[PDB]
Amino acid sequence: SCCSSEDRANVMHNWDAAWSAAYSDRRVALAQAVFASLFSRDAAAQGLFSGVSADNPDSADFRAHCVRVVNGLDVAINMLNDPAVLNEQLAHLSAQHQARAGVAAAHFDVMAEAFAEVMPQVSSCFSSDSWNRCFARIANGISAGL
Amino acid sequence: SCCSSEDRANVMHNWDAAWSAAYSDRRVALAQAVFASLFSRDAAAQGLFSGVSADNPDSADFRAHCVRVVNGLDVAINMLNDPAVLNEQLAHLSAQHQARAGVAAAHFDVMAEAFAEVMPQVSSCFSSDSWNRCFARIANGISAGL
Amino acid sequence: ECCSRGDAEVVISEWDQVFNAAMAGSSESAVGVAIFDAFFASSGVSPSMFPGGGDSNNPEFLAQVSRVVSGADIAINSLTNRATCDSLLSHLNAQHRAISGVTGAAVTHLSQAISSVVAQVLPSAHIDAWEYCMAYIAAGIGAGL
Amino acid sequence: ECCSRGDAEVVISEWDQVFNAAMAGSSESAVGVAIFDAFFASSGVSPSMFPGGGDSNNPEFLAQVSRVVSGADIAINSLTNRATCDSLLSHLNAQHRAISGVTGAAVTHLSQAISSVVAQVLPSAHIDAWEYCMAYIAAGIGAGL
Amino acid sequence: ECCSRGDAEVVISEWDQVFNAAMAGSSESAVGVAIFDAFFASSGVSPSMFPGGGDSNNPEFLAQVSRVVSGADIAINSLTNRATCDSLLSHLNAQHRAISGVTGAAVTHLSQAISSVVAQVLPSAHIDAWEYCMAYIAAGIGAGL
Amino acid sequence: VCNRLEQILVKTQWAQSYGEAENRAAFSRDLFSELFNIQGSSRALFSGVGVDDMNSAAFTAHCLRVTGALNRLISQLDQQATINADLAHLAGQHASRNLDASNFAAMGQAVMSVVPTHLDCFNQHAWGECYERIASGISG
Amino acid sequence: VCNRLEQILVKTQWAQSYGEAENRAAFSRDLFSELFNIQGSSRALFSGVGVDDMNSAAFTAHCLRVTGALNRLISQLDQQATINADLAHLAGQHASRNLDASNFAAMGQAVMSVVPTHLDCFNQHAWGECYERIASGISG
Amino acid sequence: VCNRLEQILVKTQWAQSYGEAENRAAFSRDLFSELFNIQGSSRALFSGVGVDDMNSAAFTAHCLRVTGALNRLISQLDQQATINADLAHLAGQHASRNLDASNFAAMGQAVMSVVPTHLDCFNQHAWGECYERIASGISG
Amino acid sequence: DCTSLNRLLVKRQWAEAYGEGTNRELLGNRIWEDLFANMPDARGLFSRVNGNDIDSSEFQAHSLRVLGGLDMCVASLDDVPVLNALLARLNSQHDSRGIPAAGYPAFVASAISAVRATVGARSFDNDAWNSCMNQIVSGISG
Amino acid sequence: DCTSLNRLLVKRQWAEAYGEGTNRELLGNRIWEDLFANMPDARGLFSRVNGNDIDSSEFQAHSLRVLGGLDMCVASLDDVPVLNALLARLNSQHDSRGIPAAGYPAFVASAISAVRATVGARSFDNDAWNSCMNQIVSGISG
Ligand code: HEM
Numbered sequence A, B: 001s002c003c004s005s006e007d008r009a010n011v012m013h014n015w016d017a018a019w020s021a022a023y024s025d026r027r028v029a030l031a032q033a034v035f036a037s038l039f040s041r042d043a044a045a046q047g048l049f050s051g052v053s054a055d056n057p058d059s060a061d062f063r064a065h066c067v068r069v070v071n072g073l074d075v076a077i078n079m080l081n082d083p084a085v086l087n088e089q090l091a092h093l094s095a096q097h098q099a100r101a102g103v104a105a106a107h108f109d110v111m112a113e114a115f116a117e118v119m120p121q122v123s124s125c126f127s128s129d130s131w132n133r134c135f136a137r138i139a140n141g142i143s144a145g146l
Numbered sequence C, D, E: 001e002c003c004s005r006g007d008a009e010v011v012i013s014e015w016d017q018v019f020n021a022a023m024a025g026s027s028e029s030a031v032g033v034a035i036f037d038a039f040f041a042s043s044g045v046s047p048s049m050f051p052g053g054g055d056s057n058n059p060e061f062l063a064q065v066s067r068v069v070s071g072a073d074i075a076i077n078s079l080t081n082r083a084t085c086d087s088l089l090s091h092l093n094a095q096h097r098a099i100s101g102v103t104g105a106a107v108t109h110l111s112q113a114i115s116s117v118v119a120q121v122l123p124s125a126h127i128d129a130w131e132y133c134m135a136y137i138a139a140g141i142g143a144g145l
Numbered sequence F, G, H: 001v002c003n004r005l006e007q008i009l010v011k012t013q014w015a016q017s018y019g020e021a022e023n024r025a026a027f028s029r030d031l032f033s034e035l036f037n038i039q040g041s042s043r044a045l046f047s048g049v050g051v052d053d054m055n056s057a058a059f060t061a062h063c064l065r066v067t068g069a070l071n072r073l074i075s076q077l078d079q080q081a082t083i084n085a086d087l088a089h090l091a092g093q094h095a096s097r098n099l100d101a102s103n104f105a106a107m108g109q110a111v112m113s114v115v116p117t118h119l120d121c122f123n124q125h126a127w128g129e130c131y132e133r134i135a136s137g138i139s140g
Numbered sequence I, J: 001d002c003t004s005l006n007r008l009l010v011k012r013q014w015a016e017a018y019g020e021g022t023n024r025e026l027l028g029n030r031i032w033e034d035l036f037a038n039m040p041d042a043r044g045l046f047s048r049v050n051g052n053d054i055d056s057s058e059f060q061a062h063s064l065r066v067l068g069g070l071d072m073c074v075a076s077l078d079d080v081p082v083l084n085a086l087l088a089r090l091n092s093q094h095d096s097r098g099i100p101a102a103g104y105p106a107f108v109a110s111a112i113s114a115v116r117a118t119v120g121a122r123s124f125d126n127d128a129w130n131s132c133m134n135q136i137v138s139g140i141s142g
C-alpha cells in the first residue's frame, strides 16, 4: 500500500506520456473519460457537479472543470517527490472538497477506479500497481477529514 | 553563390587568424592594403574619402577610418551566424553609404576584389571561395538600394 | 552551396524544432492557415482557388492545408539526401503542372511564406538557410511553371 | 623547495598567461620599459648606463629592453628543467661579469621588477612563487657579482 | 549496386593493398607491362599502336604504361565519390575519343586486364567487386567508342 | 472505430516510432519492404514508381509520401471533419489502381510489424482500430 | 638536379604525406587552393576546368590528375630515361596555355607549403631539387 | 624584403608553432639537429657549446638562446628601427666565428623544415622573405 | 495582439520553461524572488501561505499551485471559451484578497522574466509573451 | 590614471570578455539589462532600435554595434592620435540624441560590471578599467 520511490517515478512516467503541457485538448479527453465512468457507476454522484454543465460533457463550463481537475492531479503527481510540499497541497485540495457539500470519502473510491479504467487507454505500458498505490497516497490526503 | 553554413564557419576561421581583438595596428595594415589596391584600381574612388586624409594613408585621420571599416566588417562577419540580426546591421551600414554622396554599387565590386587580394597575405590557408561567397552576402546588403 | 548539408540539417532541425516533442500533433493547421494567409498576401493569388476556397474553417480547406504542409514536410525532412529530394520535388512538380493557375513566381511566394511563419513561430530560425533551401524546394516544384 | 616544479609551472604559466594568445606580439616593450622604469627606481641604478641610455623612445634602448625581457623569458620558460636552467643562467652571468656596474643586489632589483610588473599586468600572478623563482634566477645571473 | 560503397572501398583497399607500404615506388612498370601483356592477348589489339610500340624496354612505352596505370589509379582511388568519378572518366573518354583505334569492347579488355593482374599479384583480390567496378570505369572511358 | 483514447496511444506511439527513428527513408522503405514480403502480389502493383529497385531515388521518394501522408492522417485523427475530407481525397487517389480488401488488410499488417519493433510499448488493439479507421476512409 | 639520395627522402615523404593523408581530393584541392592564394593570376588560368567552383566534380577531378600525375613522376624519379620521356609528354600538354616561369616557381611553392604540414619530417632542399628536376622537364 | 602582410602570416605561424609546441628545448634542439643534418660543416662550428652532446645542459641551453633570440626578432618585425638595432647587435655577435653565406642559407633551411611540420598552414614565401629580412641583418 | 502564432510560441516556450517535479519550484522561486524584490509591499498579501518564508512548505505548495493555473491558461490559450471560464474561477479566487491593481502587471513582468531566464533569451518573443500574458490577467484582475 | 600597463590589462581582459559571434550578445545583454535596471529612464533614448524589446533584431544589431565601437577604442588605447579621432566620430554620433550627462557614467558602470562578470572577478582591476573606460567616455560625452 506504500507508494514507493520506484512507484512514483514509475507513475510520473506513465503520466509523462499520455500528457501534453502544451495542449489542453488531450487533458480534456482523459478527464471526460475519467468522468464518463465515474458517473456511469454512480449517477447520483453526477449531481455534485451541478455547479458545472455536467449534463453536457461536451460543454465549455464542464471541459473547464475537467482541466481544473486533471491539472490538480498533475500538480500533485509532481509533488510526489517533495512530500513536505505535497502534504500542504493535499491538505489544501482537501478543504476545497470539505467546502463542497456532499462529496464524501466513498466518492474518491468511485473516482479511484474511474481513473483506473481510463489510464491504460492513454498511457502506454501502464503500471496499474504503482498507480493504484500512489494514486491512493494522494486521494487519501484529499478525502481525509471528509 | 549562397554563403553556406560551412562557408561562414570557414570564413570566420580565416578571419579569426590574421586578427587581434587586442591590437589595432594589425587591423590597420590589413585595411590600408585593402585600400592601397582599391584606389590603385580606381583612383577616382579615392576621392570619396576626401573626408579622411586619404592622400596620406600613413595618417591618423585615415588609419582611424581604416579601423572604423575593418571593424564594421568584423562586426558583420560575426553576425554571419545570427542572420536576423545581421540583416539590420547591413540595412544599417547601408543607409550610412546611401548618406555618402557618390559611392555606388559598382564600388563594392572594386572593394570586393580589393579584399580578395589582401586576405591571402594575412590569413593562413584562406578559402577564397567561402570568402567570396560570404563577403558578397554582406556587401550585397550594404550596397543594396545604393 | 545552395542549401548545403549543414543548412538543411539546420532547417530540418528547426523545422522539427518547431514541430517538436510537445507540439506536432494538434495545430499544424494553426501554423498552416498562418501560412496560407501570408501566402495569399504576398502572392496575391486568390484563395477562391483551393479546396473549400480558403475559409480557415472549411473542413475541406483544412485537409488541403494539412496536405500542403505535409508535402513541404516530406521535402524539408529529406533535403540532406540530394537524389531523393530531386525526385520528391519532381513529383510535386507534375501535380502542379496539372493545374491552371500555378506560376513559378507564385510557388516561391508560398515557399517563402513557410520560412517566414516558421520564423515567427521559432524566432531562432536561421532565416538565411531557410531561404537558401526553401529556394531550392521552390525550384523542383515550380520547374517550368 | 626554492621554486619547485609547481611554482615554476605556475610562473611559466602566468608569465605566458601575460604573454597570451592575444598579446605576445606587439608591446613587450610597453611591458619592458615598465620594467626598466620600476628597475631604475628600486635599484637606483643609472639609466645612463644602457644602450641608448634609457630613453623609452630611443631605437637602441628598445632593442635593449627586448633583448633583456627575452633573456628573462628564456630562463623563466625553462625553470622546470633544473640542469639546463643552471646553464642558461651561468651564461647570462658571464655576460654581466664582463660589465663594470653590475651588482648582486642590483640583479635581484631588476629581477624583482619583472615579477612586480608581471603582477600589475596580471593581478592573479602568484607573487609568492614569482619571487621564489625570480630569486633563483637572480642567483645564476648575479653569481659573484 | 554496380560497384557500391563497400565494393569500391574493397577495391581501393586491395588496389592499394597491392601498392602497399613496401611496394608502390619501384616497379609499377613490372605490374604495368604485365598489364599490357595480358591486354594485348585478350584484346588482340596491336602493340604497334602505342608510344614506343610496346617493347617493354622502350623508354617511351614505359612512360606510357606509367601514364596508363596512373590513370587507372586516379579513377580506382576515387570510386567512393560518384560525382567526381563520372568526371574523371568523362575526361579520359575525350582523350580516347580523339584516337582512331579505340573500341568499347577493347577498353573493357584493358580494364579487365587490370583486375586480373591485380589478382595474380594479390591472391585475395575480391574479384567479384573488381570486375563490378572496373566494369563501371570501363564505361566512362569507352563512352560511345 | 478508433476512439478518443485509442487515438492518443497511437498518436504518441507513432511519433515515438516514426518520429524518433533515424532516417525516415529507411523506415519508409522498411515498411514497403514488408507489404511485399507479406503479399508479393502487390510488389508489382507499384510498377509505375521504380519498384524494381527499392533503393532508388524514385522508389524511396514514394515510400516517404506514404509514411508521410500516413503521418498527415494520424495527426488529424482527432479532427473528424478534416480527416474524413483528407481521407476522401486520398481514396480517389487509389481509385485507378485496382485494390482488393486483401491489400489494405496487408498494408496494415506491414505497418503493425514495422512499428512495434521501434518502441518499448505499443498497444495492438488501439492501433488496429485506427489503422482500420484509416484503411476504411482510403478504400470504402 | 635531384640526386640519388635526395630522391629517396622525397619519394618516401611524398608517400608519407600524399600517401597516408585521408582523401586525396582534399589534399589535391588543398594544393591548388594555394597556387591561387600565392598567385591569383593563375586562378583564371584554369578557366576551362570549372575553376569557378573549387568544390565541383569538374574541378576536383582536375586537381587529382595533377597530384596524380605529380605522383606518376616522383615514383619514376629513379628511372632517368622513363621520367624524361614522361616529363616530355607532360611538357607539350602545357604548350597551349601560356605559362611564365613565375607559375612553375609558384606551383612548387604551393606544393612545398602543403606537404610539410602533413609530415613529422620534411627536407626543404631535397624537395626543392626534385620539384625543380620536375618543373624543368615540364616547362623547358 | 619581408613586407607588412608577409610579416603577419609569419608572426602568427611562428607563435602557432614555436608558441604552441610542447617543450621548446625539444623544438630548439630539433632545429639545430637539422642545421647539422643539412650542413655538417657547421656542427663543429659550435665547438664552444658542448655540441658534442646535443642532449646536454650546455648544448640545449644554446639552441634556446637562438630559437629565443629568433623569437625576440619576429616579434619586433614590425618595429623597423628597433629590429634593425637589435639585428645589428646580433650581427657583431657572429663577427668572431667565420660564417659564409652558405650557413645562413642553411640555417633558414633548417628553420623552414622544422616549422611547417608543426602547423596546419604555413606560407613558404612569406617565411622566406622574413627569414631573409633576418638573415641579412645578422650577416651583412 | 496575442496572435494564433504567439499562442503557438507561448504554449511552446512555456512547456520548456515549465520544469518537472521540483524544477518548477526552480521557475517558481525565480518569479517570486523577483516580484517580491521590485515590490516588497506585495509579500504581505500572502501571510497565509507564509509569504515571508518563500521557501516554506506552505508557500512552495502555493507557489506551485499558481504555476498550475498559469499552465492551464497557456494550455487553453487555443480554445477561448474554456479559458474564459478558467480565468473566471481564478478571478473569483482573487476577488477576496486585497490585491493592488499594480500587482498583476508586476506578476506578469516577473513571470515573463522568469520564463526568459529559464528558456533562455534565445530571441524570447516579449511581444508574444506579454501580448498573451495580458490576455490572461484581464480575466483575473480586471 | 590609465597607465600604459592598464591599457595592457584592459586590452587583454576586454579580449577575453569580448565573446565571439553571439557570445557578444551575451556580454551585450549583460551590460544593457543592467543600465536599464539602475536607470530605466534610459531605455527611452533607444525607441528607434527598439529599446523596449532588448531582445529584438533591431536592438541586438545596435547592442552589437556599440560593443563594436567600444572594441576599437580598447584596440586603439595604445596609439592615442587615432583614438582621439575615433571618439570624435562617436561623439558626433551621440551629439544629436539627448543623452543625459548622468548616462555615460552609468554605461561605464554597466560595462565595467559586465566585463567583470564575463572575465570573472579574478582580482579584476577596477582602477585600471575605470581609469581607461573614462578616458574613453570623455571624447564622446564631454
Ligand atoms: C483524487 C482526485 C481529485 C482531485 C485531485 C480533484 C481536483 C479538484 C480541483 C482542483 C477542483 C477545483 C478547485 C476549486 O474549487 O476551485 C475540485 C473541485 C471539485 N471537486 Fe474534486 N478532485 C478529486 C476528487 C473528487 C471527487 C471524488 C469528487 C466527488 C464525486 C469531487 C468533487 C468536486 C466538486 C463537486 C468540485 C467543484 C465543482 C463545482 O465547481 O461545482 N472531487 N476538485
Ligand code: HEM
Pocket: B045, B048, B049, B050, B051, B052, B065, B068, B069, B071, B072, B073, B093, B096, B097, B100, B103, B104, B107, B108, B109, B111, B138, B139, B142, J089
Ligand atoms: C563591404 C565593405 C564595406 C563596409 C563594411 C564599410 C564600412 C564602413 C563603416 C563602418 C563606415 C563608417 C561609419 C560612419 O559613417 O560613421 C563607412 C563609411 C564610409 N564608407 Fe564604407 N564600407 C564598405 C564599403 C565601401 C565602399 C565600396 C565605398 C566606396 C568606394 C565606401 C565608402 C565609404 C565612405 C566614403 C565612408 C565615409 C568616410 C568619410 O568619413 O568621409 N565604403 N563604411
Ligand code: HEM
Pocket: C045, C049, C050, C051, C067, C068, C069, C070, C071, C072, C092, C095, C096, C099, C101, C102, C103, C106, C107, C108, C110, C111, C138, C141, F093
Ligand atoms: C511550396 C510549394 C507548394 C507546396 C508545399 C505544395 C504542395 C502540394 C501538395 C502536397 C498537394 C496535394 C497533392 C495531392 O493532390 O495529392 C498540393 C495540391 C494543390 N496545390 Fe500545391 N503546393 C505548393 C504551391 C502551390 C501554389 C503556388 C499554388 C497556387 C496558388 C498551389 C495550389 C494547389 C492546388 C489548387 C492543389 C490541388 C487541390 C487538391 O488537392 O484538391 N500549390 N500542393
Ligand code: HEM
Pocket: D045, D049, D050, D051, D067, D068, D069, D070, D071, D072, D092, D095, D096, D099, D101, D102, D103, D106, D107, D108, D110, D111, D138, D141, H093
Ligand atoms: C634579471 C636580470 C637581468 C636580465 C634578464 C639580464 C639579461 C641580459 C641580456 C639577455 C642581455 C643581452 C645579452 C647580449 O649581449 O647578447 C643583457 C645585456 C646587458 N645588461 Fe643585463 N640582465 C639583467 C640584469 C642587469 C642589471 C642588474 C644591469 C645593470 C644595472 C644590467 C645591464 C646590462 C648591460 C649594460 C648590458 C649590455 C648592453 C648591450 O647589450 O649592448 N643587466 N642583459
Ligand code: HEM
Pocket: E045, E049, E050, E051, E067, E068, E069, E070, E071, E072, E092, E095, E096, E099, E101, E102, E103, E106, E107, E108, E110, E111, E138, E141, G093
Ligand atoms: C582501362 C582503360 C584505359 C586506361 C586506364 C587508359 C588511360 C589512358 C591515359 C591515362 C592516357 C594518357 C593521357 C594523356 O595523353 O595525358 C592514355 C593514352 C592513350 N591510350 Fe588509353 N587507357 C585505357 C584504354 C586504352 C585502350 C583500350 C587503348 C587502345 C588499344 C588505349 C590507347 C591509348 C593511346 C594510343 C594513348 C595515347 C598515347 C600517348 O599518350 O602519347 N587506351 N590512356
Ligand code: HEM
Pocket: F042, F045, F046, F047, F048, F049, F065, F066, F069, F070, F093, F094, F097, F099, F103, F104, F105, F107, F134, F135, F138
Ligand atoms: C492505408 C495506407 C495507405 C496510405 C496512407 C497510402 C498513401 C498513398 C499516397 C499519399 C500516394 C501518393 C499519391 C500522390 O501524392 O499523388 C499513394 C499512391 C499509391 N498507392 Fe497508396 N496508400 C495506402 C494504401 C495502399 C495500399 C494498401 C496499396 C496496395 C497494395 C496502395 C497502392 C498505391 C499505388 C499503386 C499508388 C500509385 C503510385 C504509382 O504507382 O504511381 N496504397 N498512396
Ligand code: HEM
Pocket: G042, G045, G046, G047, G048, G049, G065, G066, G069, G070, G093, G094, G097, G099, G103, G104, G105, G107, G134, G135, G138
Ligand atoms: C609541376 C607541376 C605540374 C604538373 C605535374 C601538372 C600536371 C598537369 C596534368 C597532368 C594536366 C592534365 C593533362 C591531361 O590529362 O590531358 C595539366 C593540365 C593543365 N595545367 Fe598543369 N601541371 C603542372 C604545372 C602547371 C602550372 C605551374 C600551371 C600554371 C599555373 C599549369 C597549368 C595547367 C593548365 C592550364 C592545364 C589545362 C587544364 C584545362 O584548363 O583544360 N600546370 N597539368
Ligand code: HEM
Pocket: H042, H045, H046, H047, H048, H049, H065, H066, H069, H070, H093, H094, H097, H099, H103, H104, H105, H107, H134, H135, H138
Ligand atoms: C639567423 C639565425 C640566427 C640567430 C637568430 C642566431 C642567434 C644567436 C645568438 C643569440 C647567439 C648567442 C649570443 C649570446 O647570447 O652571447 C648565437 C651564437 C652563435 N651563433 Fe648564431 N644565430 C643565427 C645564425 C647562425 C648561423 C647560420 C650560424 C652558423 C652555422 C651561427 C653560429 C653561431 C655561433 C658559432 C655562435 C657562438 C656560440 C659559441 O660557440 O660560443 N649562428 N647565435
Ligand code: HEM
Pocket: I042, I045, I046, I048, I049, I062, I065, I066, I067, I068, I069, I070, I071, I090, I093, I094, I097, I099, I100, I103, I104, I105, I107, I136, I137, I140
Ligand atoms: C498570472 C496570473 C496568476 C496566476 C496563474 C494565479 C493563480 C493562482 C492560484 C492557482 C491560486 C490558488 C487558488 C486556490 O487554490 O484557491 C492563487 C491564489 C492567490 N493569488 Fe494568484 N495568480 C496570479 C497572479 C496573482 C497576483 C498578481 C497576485 C498578487 C500580487 C496574486 C496573489 C494571490 C493570493 C493573495 C492568493 C491567495 C494565497 C493562498 O491562500 O493560496 N496572484 N493564485
Ligand code: HEM
Pocket: J042, J045, J046, J048, J049, J062, J065, J066, J067, J068, J069, J070, J071, J090, J093, J094, J097, J099, J100, J103, J104, J105, J107, J136, J137, J140
Ligand atoms: C562607452 C561608450 C559608448 C560606446 C562604445 C557607444 C557606441 C555607439 C555606437 C557604435 C553607436 C552606433 C553609431 C552609428 O552607427 O551611427 C551608438 C549609438 C547610440 N548610442 Fe552609444 N556608445 C556608448 C555609450 C552610450 C551612452 C552613455 C548612451 C546613453 C545612455 C548611448 C546611447 C546611444 C544612442 C541613443 C545611440 C543611437 C541609437 C541608434 O539609432 O543606433 N551610448 N553608440
Ligand code: MMC
Pocket: A035, A049, A052, A054, A062, A063, A065, A066
Ligand atoms: C465534472 Hg468535468
Ligand code: MMC
Pocket: B035, B049, B052, B054, B062, B063, B065, B066
Ligand atoms: C580610406 Hg582608410
Ligand code: MMC
Pocket: C003, C004, C008, C078, C079, C080, C081, C082, C085, C086, C133, C136
Ligand atoms: C538540399 Hg534538396
Ligand code: MMC
Pocket: D003, D004, D008, D078, D079, D080, D081, D082, D085, D086, D133, D136
Ligand atoms: C627552477 Hg631553475
Ligand code: MMC
Pocket: E003, E004, E008, E078, E079, E080, E081, E082, E085, E086, E133, E136
Ligand atoms: C563507384 Hg565510380
Ligand code: MMC
Pocket: F029, F032, F046, F049, F051, F059, F060, F062, F063
Ligand atoms: C512503392 Hg516504395
Ligand code: MMC
Pocket: G029, G032, G046, G049, G051, G059, G060, G062, G063
Ligand atoms: C584546376 Hg583544380
